[PDB]
Amino acid sequence: MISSLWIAKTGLDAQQTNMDVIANNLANVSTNGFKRQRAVFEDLLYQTIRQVLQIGTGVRPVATERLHSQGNLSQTNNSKDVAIKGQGFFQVMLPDGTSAYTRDGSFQVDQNGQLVTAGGFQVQPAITIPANALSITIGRDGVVSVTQQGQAAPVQVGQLNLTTFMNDTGLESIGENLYIETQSSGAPNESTPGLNGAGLLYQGYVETSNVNVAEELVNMIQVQRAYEINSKAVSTTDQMLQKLTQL
Amino acid sequence: MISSLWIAKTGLDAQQTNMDVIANNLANVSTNGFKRQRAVFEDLLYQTIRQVLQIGTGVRPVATERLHSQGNLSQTNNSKDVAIKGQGFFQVMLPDGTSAYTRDGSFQVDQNGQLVTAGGFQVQPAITIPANALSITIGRDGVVSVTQQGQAAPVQVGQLNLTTFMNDTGLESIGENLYIETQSSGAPNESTPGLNGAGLLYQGYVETSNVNVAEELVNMIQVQRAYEINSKAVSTTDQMLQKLTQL
Amino acid sequence: MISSLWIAKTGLDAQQTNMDVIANNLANVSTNGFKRQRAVFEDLLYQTIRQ
Amino acid sequence: MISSLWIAKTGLDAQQTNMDVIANNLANVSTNGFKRQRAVFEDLLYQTIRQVLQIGTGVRPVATERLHSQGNLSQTNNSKDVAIKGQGFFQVMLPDGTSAYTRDGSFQVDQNGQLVTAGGFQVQPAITIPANALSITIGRDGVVSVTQQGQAAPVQVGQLNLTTFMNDTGLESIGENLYIETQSSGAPNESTPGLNGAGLLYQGYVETSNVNVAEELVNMIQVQRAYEINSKAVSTTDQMLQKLTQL
């Protein structure tokens, strides 16, 4: 009755949410530095009547759980492309003054010669970009050691450190592969790149998504199948309902 | 339901836009002084319900992002062909009075003896072209030091400077490999060629497109494959839809 | 999946860059006092999960 | 049901990981001093119910297992190229102060006249490189017996020993054909080259990868075929699934 009603309901929304999770987890290929999520089906409190006579409740997905793994990467060969071998996150300023974190390989200049990224999102710490800076020879740990015209020297026009945290599951994607520090994110530490969990700067390259598709295509197929099996359970429930409202 | 609907929609248009981007990025070989674009897939705001129970949205391509790299170049050996070693952009007048910028190696004369390009688009600054000017010995920095008939001297009949900017991503192709100054383009500076980021004049030659094809052919293949995988996701979604409208 | 995608990508661009390097290294005969270049294929960081 | 689901899953990821392993094992030709890896498919615990009524689980790849064999080598004839006949590993300093190990044949000088390699990675022990050192006559066991201008003698400007270990499978490639001592790597011993497993210095030459391709091309073909056969197993499983959700 109401038992099969709510049980079919929670199986329906569990399989629906699983379908939406893997559906959003297949379309996010070529998202830069991306870590993919997945739901975990878990029960609820059971209800024992007598020592063992229980009831049993719950098939619930708890939450979508991230997978912080370095995905595929591409050899792009541009000075405005920097990947990070291993871990360590970037630190860039949002234009409202707040910070941001990412794994990005696409940075630009504004009209006023500052270093920004993603079409005008300034870095942390900020770097002014000249026009006579011919070559851009970036050090592995933030040393923006460019060479200007008439200046035959790798002039360090900027120094950058990498921010590390304690639980990157608490970090949340806040729009176009950006992250900010949350409660469960951990404590920030812009340590020197190459130490304390931070990687180094690979100039010329980008990071991308850790999206394994064919495994999650099998997951799509089996979640569709379990959605249809929940539909079969609803069909049997409503067949009993119509045969008993005939009764 | 609507979740899988919009998710399949944005994966569909992301892969479609990627296919169109690489499709337009393969046909533009032999375009002179050309810098090729590419889209970047990026998420949107996620939606946390509880400290970590999120929702997650976005696979969006942000924009097509240019790659300002010197492509292939050809040895053409004509005085109306001038390439630029390195950087520095040309400055030519549009016939409505406005300026234009390019990396061109094909310039002409009008009926009235002025220096134009691309079939009647005047240079900046303008140069009058005589008829007794036998040889055209162009200096490396705009010195149009031609030698006229009866005048055994490299008569400088024109001086040209090269315009530099601050963010060439803001420059937009405004028709037949032309560019004009935009907001994000940077500040113009027609400095002497050979300094402040400007190159020199290579008389006899042209610049061309930075189009790497086989890498982007692999990109075409994988975007076709991901388009088909999004089609498989739509197929599973609609199979659940038809089996549940059977229910 | 993405693994074979990027692996085929970096093998493709490595062999392409090698082809361009030897291609530019064969046309530069009779260049005066010239010293020729060559690329060196090298790995990246490996990723150990367990000893 | 779930049995065929997880069995198809582990066969799918086993064949996928095998495909990625041989795919990364075919692109690493001309990597210097390289030893190639390979996965090993192995079962899990079986589950006997009665003395023999078992269940049986596992097709798992355990890990990628290196093959420490000397590959192909090339006659390069440069004093900055040194191969090692047989075994024995180099010892070079990483710029953070830590050591490194390799089989390299490409070493350089810095701006400040020290001996480095790979574009500025100093050797262990460090050697200062003069400018009047005309010829570089390297001894077979680290004797950098160069001859300086005005000094008609093989002046030993450096001595080098070779580091040996106990299990080179524990050594891990830490970026651009470098290695460092790990737990399973063994104990280091920079013995004299030519003894205790160490080879000698072949000035003029390099070592390279032990990549046999056509055998591993047959491996690529058969892993593709077994991937398709796992796909056939998934197809039969889902055909039973759809014919039984018809039931």
Residue numbers in the entry:
A (entry chain A), B (entry chain F), D (entry chain G): 1 to 51, 65 to 260
C (entry chain a): 1 to 51
Would you copy out the relevant sentences from the publication that reported this structure?
The axial structure consists of three morphologically distinct regions, the rod, the hook, and the filament from the proximal to the distal end, with a few minor components. The function of the hook is a universal joint that transmits motor torque to the filament in any orientation relative to the motor axis. The rod is a drive shaft that penetrates the peptidoglycan (PG) layer and the outer membrane and connects the hook with the rotor of the motor.
We constructed a structural model of the flagellar distal rod by fitting the crystal structure of FlgG20 into the previous cryoEM map of a polyrod and a new hook model using the previous cryoEM map of the hook. We found here that the elongated density can be assigned as the l-stretch, as is seen in Cj-FlgE, considering the structural similarity between FlgG20 and Cj-FlgE and the amino acid sequence similarity between St-FlgG and Cj-FlgE. The new model revealed that the l-stretch extensively contacts with the D1 domains of other FlgG subunits and thereby reinforces the rod structure. The l-stretch extends along the D1 domain of FlgG in the −5 position toward that in the −10 position. The l-stretch also interacts with the D1 domains of FlgG in the −11 and −16 positions and thereby mediates the 6-start interactions of the subunits in the −5 and −11 positions and those in the −10 and −16 positions. In addition, the l-stretch mediates the 6-start interaction of −5 and −11 subunits and 0 and −11 subunits. These 5-start and 6-start interaction networks make the distal rod rigid in its straight form. Moreover, the tight interaction of l-stretch with the D1 domain in the −5 position may stabilize the upright orientation of FlgG, forming tight subunit packing in the distal rod.
